[PDB]
Design a protein around this ligand. Structure first.
Ligand SMILES: CCCC/C=C/CCCCCCCC(=O)OC[C@H](COP(=O)([O-])O)OC(=O)CCCCCCCCCCCCC
Ligand SMILES: CCCC/C=C/CCCCCCCC(=O)OC[C@H](COP(=O)([O-])O)OC(=O)CCCCCCCCCCCCC
Ligand SMILES: CCCC/C=C/CCCCCCCC(=O)OC[C@H](COP(=O)([O-])O)OC(=O)CCCCCCCCCCCCC
Ligand SMILES: CCCC/C=C/CCCCCCCC(=O)OC[C@H](COP(=O)([O-])O)OC(=O)CCCCCCCCCCCCC
Ligand SMILES: CCCC/C=C/CCCCCCCC(=O)OC[C@H](COP(=O)([O-])O)OC(=O)CCCCCCCCCCCCC
Ligand SMILES: CCCC/C=C/CCCCCCCC(=O)OC[C@H](COP(=O)([O-])O)OC(=O)CCCCCCCCCCCCC
Ligand SMILES: CCCC/C=C/CCCCCCCC(=O)OC[C@H](COP(=O)([O-])O)OC(=O)CCCCCCCCCCCCC
Ligand SMILES: CCCC/C=C/CCCCCCCC(=O)OC[C@H](COP(=O)([O-])O)OC(=O)CCCCCCCCCCCCC
Ligand SMILES: CCCC/C=C/CCCCCCCC(=O)OC[C@H](COP(=O)([O-])O)OC(=O)CCCCCCCCCCCCC
Ligand SMILES: CCCC/C=C/CCCCCCCC(=O)OC[C@H](COP(=O)([O-])O)OC(=O)CCCCCCCCCCCCC
Ligand SMILES: CCCC/C=C/CCCCCCCC(=O)OC[C@H](COP(=O)([O-])O)OC(=O)CCCCCCCCCCCCC
Ligand SMILES: CCCC/C=C/CCCCCCCC(=O)OC[C@H](COP(=O)([O-])O)OC(=O)CCCCCCCCCCCCC
Ligand SMILES: CCCC/C=C/CCCCCCCC(=O)OC[C@H](COP(=O)([O-])O)OC(=O)CCCCCCCCCCCCC
Ligand SMILES: CCCC/C=C/CCCCCCCC(=O)OC[C@H](COP(=O)([O-])O)OC(=O)CCCCCCCCCCCCC
Ligand SMILES: CCCC/C=C/CCCCCCCC(=O)OC[C@H](COP(=O)([O-])O)OC(=O)CCCCCCCCCCCCC
Ligand SMILES: CCCC/C=C/CCCCCCCC(=O)OC[C@H](COP(=O)([O-])O)OC(=O)CCCCCCCCCCCCC
Lengths: 65, 65, 65, 65, 65, 65, 65, 65, 65, 65, 65, 65, 65, 65, 65, 65, 65, 65, 65, 65
């Protein structure tokens, strides 16, 4: 008797591991990092996209959708 | 002579430990954390999904539904 | 010559220490706290369910139903 | 020559210090306070049942039934 | 010798668990919630249809028509 | 003996899943979001139309008209 | 038996993909961005008109008017 | 059946490519840059008017008024 | 044998699609919107006359006078 | 057989495009904007009289008095 | 048949281009600017009276009283 | 028919070129500059009273009271 | 054959342009404005007596007593 | 034939230019300003009594009692 | 014929130049200044009691009670 | 006829020159200064208690309680 | 021939300057002010009893009983 | 001939200087201040009980019961 | 003739010097201070429980319950 | 007659010296210190867990639960 069971499918494909939103977030990270590195010359901005990637992976395994 | 005993079943499966609402809350946490980390570069946002998980567990054992 | 003595039983089992209404109130507290913590990142919301629990206990001993 | 002297007994046991109505009023106070605290997070609602209790005591000593 | 026994049938099918009025009430809830969420951006409006559903169920079991 | 059975058809096509009112609500959401994003520059307004869409779907399956 | 079918045409041409309101919103974005960049010298304001454009496109395909 | 078609002309000549407001914005940029360069001696302020100019051009071609 | 058939003509020209009352209502809307926008500076008042117009159209087609 | 046709003339000259009320509204806008700019130093108040002007024009063409 | 034509004269001399209210507004601007410059040492306050002057001029030509 | 013409005299002598308020503002500038120079040893504070003086002069000629 | 012609004189001097009632209304406005300005510090109260004056003038010319 | 001419004298001396009420209003202004300045340290409160004084003067000349 | 002339005496001695309320206000200023200086180490708080004193003097001469 | 004359005594001994509150303020100053000097090694913190002392003296002579 | 002259004495001592009712009103004012100040921390409540006192005095001199 | 003289005694001992109500008000002040100081860390809450005490004293001397 | 004398006992033991509420307030202070010190590293939070303790003592001696 | 005596036990074991919350606070301190030391290389972060420990001890002895 679960009254919100009908939506998982949609959610899983719009906000999920294989979805467009996630790729847009990672693309934004790349561009922000490049623009900041040009202005400050600080190496901490060259790792940005890596730490996010691993993070997202570890996250989606805890939800189990 | 308990007059609201008939509903527990439904409640327990719609708002419970094994329910879709809880997974949607945790998914929202992941996405909010990623978007905030991209804009501020602050590490406090990388722990978000963990502290929530433990919290929910400790909560559902106190209700005992 | 008490004219409302016949109802205590029912009341005590519908609005009492061992009743479904109380568990629904505590469950609502858990869910509200999680949703608020996700949006504000403020630790005051992680204690909610504890303070309510003790409160209810201290209350039901003063009524003595 | 008091023409309403016959009823005190009944009144004293239905609307009195040791009566069911008073316990139902205090129980309602507990429940209202918990539900309001969950929605507002304001501490003024955690004192409700105390101030009522003392109040009722001081009242019943002035009537002297 | 029950003088209003003839009507239950009609009532049970016009104002009952399986009736059109109940579905119209739940539909109104959905639409009101969507319109309010668009104007305020407050999440309390996304739960509306669930709490009503459970409520109606628990109600119709107490009447026993 | 259901006395309001004659109207479902009309209702289902005027206030339903495939109806004009729903599309006008979603269009209003798009426009409100764009105007607010221009003035505040806050990303929470870029998700508006998605969360509403899923919501409506999950709603219309619970009514079953 | 749809009772509001007569208006779509008008709506689609006044609040639509090819309408004047949308162009006025995008023009406002350009001007706000220029005035803010002059006062703060922050590059985040140089992307404004792009993100809005894509957004509107993705929106109008979900409504399907 | 476009109900706001009558205004484009006026808008296009008051808030447009060939309008006085745009020239006042660029003039303000020149003056702000000179005053800031005098106080800080930083070369980033000598490019201000160029980047704005190109920006406005690219903007007005996307609106197509 | 319709006993009120003689009046439609008059009604249709005094309270109708092409009548003076409707234009006075729309004129009042324009003036109220301008006066409110001057005092609050809120954009919701700039759409008033549009939503009314479409509304009236959709209405007069349902009456069919 | 239009029973309110006699008044348009008067209305059109008292509440119209060429009327004193409209000029008083625009004058009030100028003065309010100046007084607010003096106290806050915010540029949004320097555009007030323009947006109103265009608005009124677009309005009076939809009424067609 | 203009019913408010009798007042323009008075208005034009009390709230107009050559009126005392306007001079009091500009005087207030001068004094506010001096007091703020003394406390912050920020040059943006030295232009205040100029931008207001031009503004008022451009305004009074659009009203045409 | 100017309805606020009676006050200029008073205003001109209380908030004017030859008034006490202006001298108090300039005196405050002197004292603030001395106290700041003692703590920072920065020469920009030794010009304060000059730039204000010229400013006030140029201001009072634009008001023409 | 006008049956109420005898009273105009009296009316015109008791409720008229040159009458005591009007001066008492304007005096009340002055006092209310001062008391409100002292408590709120809002400038809208400093214009009160002006707008009323013009209003009364424009009114008495429309009656023509 | 003015029927309320007998009272002006009294009014003019109780609610007038030379009356006690006006002095009490100005005294209240002084005290409110001092108490607010002590708590906020904002200079806008040091001008209060001046602006009121001029205001009252300009008011009493328009009434002409 | 002044109807509130009887109270000046009392007022003048309770809310006046030589009254206890004024001394309590100045004492509060001293204490607030000391406590704030201890926490911030900012010299603007060492002048507080002086500026208030002069202010009160200049005020009481304008009321003339 | 001074209506608040009865309290001076109490005030003068609780908030006065010879009172405990003043000594607690000076003690707090000593402790804050020592803790700050330990962390920054800046000599400006070694004068704190002196400047406060003189200040309080000069203050209490202006109140004259 | 005054037909109600016999009662003044009684009235003057029950509702008068030296009567118990007046003291009860002033006592109520004190208590209300204290309770409100405790809950809001707003200084306007500390003046209550003073303004009432003067008021009553000025009132009883106008009646002359 | 004072008709309410019989009650002063009772009033004076229930609502008076030496009464329980006053002590309960002061106790409430202490507790409210402590709870607020814990949450905000603002020193204004540490003076609460003092200012009330003096206030009550000054009040009871004006009533003279 | 004190009508609320019967309650002091209860009050004195529930809201008093030796009561559980006071210990819960001090415990809350300890926990809040520790959590804040962990996040900010500011020493002002290490004194919290001391200043409250003394405060409560000084308070309970002024009430004298 | 202590009305909240029933809860101490629970409180003492959930918020106490031997409780899980305290250990979680100290664990958080360790982790925050390590992460900060890695990024800044400042030795002040290596003492964190010690100062907290002593603090908590000294606190729990003052409450005496
Ligand atoms: C729906 C369409 C999505 C389209 C995705 C394309 C994204 C392209 C973004 C490129 C922007 C580059 C701008 C930039 O680098 O400026 C630097 C600023 C730094 O500002 P700050 O650190 O000084 O406060 O950086 C910032 O502060 C933030 C600016 C960038 C944030 C906006 C992008 C958010 C999109 C996230 C999508 C969420 C979808 C639900
Ligand atoms: C029923 C369908 C549920 C679908 C669940 C999908 C959720 C996907 C959400 C992704 C949104 C990402 C937006 C974002 O990151 O923006 C950042 C903002 C921060 O705003 P602020 O901190 O500046 O005030 O973040 C915010 O402030 C909050 C924005 C996100 C909150 C909306 C999500 C709430 C859904 C909870 C479901 C409750 C169900 C009863
Ligand atoms: C009879 C069936 C009971 C079913 C119980 C299931 C409860 C599940 C509730 C989950 C709701 C989550 C919504 C949420 O978190 O939104 C946050 C808002 C906060 O609003 P605000 O602070 O901005 O004013 O939060 C709020 O403001 C309040 C929203 C939640 C209140 C509704 C729940 C009340 C049920 C209490 C039952 C009483 C029974 C007599
Ligand atoms: C004879 C049988 C008695 C049974 C007693 C059981 C009582 C259980 C009550 C639980 C109700 C909880 C509902 C609740 O908390 O909602 C909050 C509202 C607040 O409304 P508002 O503040 O926004 O106006 O709260 C309210 O506004 C008031 C709602 C509660 C009032 C109804 C209870 C009155 C019973 C009193 C008995 C009198 C007997 C003569
Ligand atoms: C017999 C045919 C039934 C047809 C059912 C279709 C229902 C469709 C309703 C859609 C209406 C949407 C309007 C809306 O969302 O406006 C918001 C307002 C909120 O007003 P407020 O909160 O500001 O006071 O919302 C409101 O305040 C209430 C407006 C909606 C209430 C009217 C619907 C009641 C129908 C119930 C049927 C009962 C049958 C016995
Ligand atoms: C029947 C014809 C329907 C036609 C549909 C076209 C809708 C087009 C709407 C475009 C309006 C844009 C205005 C806007 O963005 O202003 C922002 C405001 C925000 O106000 P606030 O947040 O500051 O209180 O936003 C608001 O607060 C709300 C303003 C918009 C609400 C009005 C639209 C409601 C239509 C819903 C239709 C219901 C049908 C039953
Ligand atoms: C119907 C005729 C439409 C005419 C369209 C022409 C638009 C031209 C607008 C140019 C305004 C430039 C002003 C400006 O840049 O000031 C900056 C402010 C920023 O304020 P803030 O960030 O400090 O709160 O910016 C703001 O905060 C917002 C100010 C701009 C908002 C007003 C424009 C809204 C028009 C939207 C049309 C909706 C139609 C339904
Ligand atoms: C309608 C008439 C328009 C007249 C146009 C003439 C503009 C002349 C402006 C010259 C101002 C020079 C002042 C200056 O350089 O000071 C520097 C400050 C920097 O402040 P900050 O960086 O320290 O926060 O700079 C600033 O922070 C901003 C100060 C300048 C902003 C005001 C100009 C805005 C006019 C835009 C017109 C919009 C029309 C809708
Ligand atoms: C026949 C003799 C006439 C004597 C004329 C002398 C008038 C002197 C009036 C001075 C009253 C000042 C009181 C005041 O300022 O209080 C403010 C209140 C505001 O109340 P609110 O806004 O909070 O609802 O303000 C108000 O709300 C209204 C209070 C004032 C209204 C009473 C005056 C009406 C007289 C009009 C004469 C009509 C003759 C037919
Ligand atoms: C008939 C006898 C008249 C006696 C005149 C003596 C007046 C002495 C008044 C001194 C009061 C000082 C109180 C004070 O400064 O508190 C500040 C508050 C501010 O409140 P807020 O801004 O936070 O809403 O300030 C306020 O909000 C308003 C409080 C003061 C208003 C009351 C005085 C009104 C008297 C006007 C006389 C009218 C006669 C018709
Ligand atoms: C009738 C008896 C009068 C007794 C007079 C003795 C006054 C002694 C006051 C000493 C209080 C010291 C408290 C203090 O310094 O705290 C600082 C706060 C600053 O708060 P903030 O700036 O952070 O908002 O400071 C504040 O924000 C304000 C706190 C002080 C305000 C209360 C004193 C008002 C009394 C005025 C008397 C008016 C009589 C009508
Ligand atoms: C009623 C009992 C009074 C007991 C008096 C004993 C006072 C002992 C205080 C010792 C505290 C030492 C703490 C310390 O030095 O920390 C440094 C901080 C500096 O903070 P910041 O500069 O980084 O913002 O310093 C601060 O920022 C401020 C912290 C100290 C302020 C609290 C003391 C105020 C008491 C004043 C009494 C007023 C009575 C009405
Ligand atoms: C004949 C015996 C008289 C005995 C006199 C003793 C009076 C003692 C009164 C103490 C009551 C304290 C209660 C209190 O402070 O509560 C605050 C409320 C405020 O309510 P609100 O502002 O939120 O609407 O305050 C109020 O709203 C009003 C509550 C107080 C009003 C009742 C007192 C009226 C007595 C007047 C005597 C008239 C005799 C003809
Ligand atoms: C007859 C028996 C009397 C018993 C007296 C014992 C009193 C004990 C009270 C302890 C309550 C502590 C609660 C507290 O501190 O919460 C803080 C709130 C602040 O709320 P806010 O500022 O956010 O609106 O604080 C408040 O807003 C107000 C809450 C406290 C007010 C209730 C106490 C009133 C009793 C007055 C007695 C009057 C007798 C006629
Ligand atoms: C009846 C049972 C009582 C049980 C007592 C146990 C208390 C344990 C409390 C531990 C809470 C720790 C939470 C915490 O430290 O979070 C920090 C926040 C700071 O918030 P902010 O400064 O950012 O606005 O801190 C806060 O802002 C406030 C959060 C803590 C306030 C809630 C505790 C109040 C209880 C008082 C009892 C009154 C009884 C009448
Ligand atoms: C109920 C389950 C509890 C689980 C306990 C496990 C705690 C593990 C925490 C590890 C987090 C490490 C994150 C970190 O080091 O980031 C550094 C930031 C510094 O931020 P800032 O200084 O730049 O403002 O650090 C911060 O600013 C603060 C981030 C850490 C604060 C969150 C932990 C609070 C838990 C307290 C429990 C209270 C229970 C009532």
């Amino acid at each position: 008797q679960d009254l919100m069971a009908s939506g998982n499918t949609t959610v899983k494909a719009t906000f999920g591991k294989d979805s467009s939103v996630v790729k847009w977030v990672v693309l934004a990270e790349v561009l922000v990092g490049a623009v900041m590195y040009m202005m400050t010359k600080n190496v901490k901005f060259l790792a940005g996209f890596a730490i996010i990637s691993v993070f997202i992976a570890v996250g989606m395994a805890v939800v189990g959708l």
